[PDB]
Amino acid sequence: DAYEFAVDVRDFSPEDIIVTTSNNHIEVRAEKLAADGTVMNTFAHKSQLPEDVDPTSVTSALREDGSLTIRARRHP
């Protein structure tokens, strides 16, 4: 059975986005860098996947509305 949630990263481009998992912790992060390479705009969304979801199965996609979707499978 599928698990999915959406994160609003509409102010950022795909190349700006990072998805991290640590066990069942998931972080969607986005940054824009200035010319000097410092951070001009930063965003992070930290949440926890349900116990019955497999963290290794997480995939992400940028949806047409500009948000990012996290999809993952549950263990049966």
Author numbering: 85 to 160
The authors write:
HSPB7 is a member of the small Heat-Shock Protein (sHSP) family, and is expressed specifically in heart and skeletal muscle. Though it shares the common architecture of sHSPs (an α-crystallin domain, ACD, flanked by N- and C-terminal regions), HSPB7 is unusual as it has been observed to be oligomerisation incompetent. FLNC interacts with HSPB7, also known as cardiovascular heat-shock protein (cvHSP), via d2417–20. Our work therefore shows, structurally, how HSPB7 acts as a specific molecular chaperone that regulates FLNC dimerisation.
To investigate why none of the HSPB7 constructs dimerise to an appreciable extent, we turned to X-ray crystallography. We undertook crystallisation trials on HSPB7ACD and HSPB7ΔN, but did not obtain any protein crystals. We speculated that this might be due to a solvent-accessible cysteine (C131) leading to non-specific intermolecular interactions during crystallisation, and hence generated the C131S mutant of both constructs. Of these, HSPB7ACDC131S returned good crystals, which diffracted to 2.2 Å resolution; the structure was solved by molecular replacement in the P41212 space group. B The Ig-fold is very similar to that of other sHSP ACDs: it contains six β strands, with a groove between β4 and β8 and an extended “β6 + 7” strand. The monomers within the asymmetric unit contact each other through crystallographic interfaces between neighbouring anti-parallel β4 and β6 + 7 strands that form long chains of monomers in the crystal. The lack of a head-to-head dimer in the crystal form is different to most sHSP ACD structures that have been determined, but is consistent with our native MS data that showed monomers to be the dominant form in solution. A rationale for this might be that the β6 + 7 strand is shorter in HSPB7 compared to that found in the canonical human sHSPs; in particular it is missing charged amino acids at positions 118 and 129 that form inter-monomer salt bridges in HSPB1 and HSPB5. These differences likely act to reduce the strength of a putative anti-parallel interaction of two β6 + 7 strands (as per the canonical metazoan sHSP dimer), with the result that HSPB7 exists primarily as a monomer.
